């Protein structure tokens, strides 16, 4: 029951959505050289499972097909990356382990962003990432398995701000078309 539309620089590409149908698409087939994050979701996140289906094409693009959201305190930005382009965030970040969920292992890592854009303006926050090793573009994400693993490493696992299925990119070109079931 979609009630939040995520649009962070959606203007850099062609973002279309229908909250009633639970569908959206994003074309950035001419390329982008700045960050966008677009998607559909809920004003308050939870640990309920999310089922989605997508056509996602982002080879040669620093991009993610991800469940994305925030925790108010301790302030954290989080990603459960189902598929991605050229860039793996865990290659550079502090490794936390591996979690197994919904048919694959996920590399888990963390990072700290200082004086960067956040749900409160500009601030310092922690990032948690689960990056799928056998990437896919459809399935169920049992969000609770990721939240419970990250909670061992300081993730607040309560006091949630928004949560969306999102497409992000900051370079390259591609397209995406997603349905949330």
From Swiss-Prot:
Disulfide bonds join 90-109. GO terms for molecular function: endo-1,4-beta-xylanase activity. Keywords: Carbohydrate metabolism, Disulfide bond, Glycosidase, Hydrolase, Polysaccharide degradation, Secreted, Signal, Xylan degradation. It catalyses: Endohydrolysis of (1->4)-beta-D-xylosidic linkages in xylans. It is found in: Secreted. Gene3D superfamilies: 2.60.120.180. The active site is at residues 77, 168. Its EC number is 3.2.1.8. Residues 1-181 form the GH11 domain. Pathway: Glycan degradation; xylan degradation. It comes from the Eukaryota. GO terms for cellular component: extracellular region. The keyword Methyltransferase does not apply. Optimum pH is 3.0. The keyword Protein biosynthesis does not apply. Its main location: secreted. GO terms for biological process: xylan catabolic process. Belongs to the glycosyl hydrolase 11 (cellulase G) family. Endo-1,4-beta-xylanase involved in the hydrolysis of xylan, a major structural heterogeneous polysaccharide found in plant biomass representing the second most abundant polysaccharide in the biosphere, after cellulose. This is Endo-1,4-beta-xylanase A. It comes from Aspergillus niger. The gene is xynA.
């Amino acid at each position: 029951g979609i009630n939040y539309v995520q649009n962070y620089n959606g203007n850099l590409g062609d973002f279309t959505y229908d909250e009633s149908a639970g569908t959206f698409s994003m074309y950035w087939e001419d390329g982008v050289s700045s960050d966008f994050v677009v998607g559909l979701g809920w004003t308050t996140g939870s640990s309920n499972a999310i089922t989605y289906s997508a056509e996602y094409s982002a080879s040669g693009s620093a991009s993610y097909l991800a469940v994305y959201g925030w925790v108010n305190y301790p302030q954290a930005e989080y990603y459960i990356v189902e598929d991605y382009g050229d860039y793996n965030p865990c290659s550079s970040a502090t490794s936390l382990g591996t979690v197994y969920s919904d048919g694959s292992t996920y590399q888990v890592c963390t990072d700290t962003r200082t004086n960067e854009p956040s749900i409160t303006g500009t601030s310092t926050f922690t990032q948690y990432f689960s990056v799928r090793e056998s990437t896919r573009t459809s399935g169920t994400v049992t969000v609770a398995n990721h939240f419970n693993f990250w909670a061992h490493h300081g993730f607040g696992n309560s006091d949630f701000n928004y949560q969306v299925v999102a497409v992000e990119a900051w370079s390259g070109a591609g397209s995406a078309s997603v349905t949330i079931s």
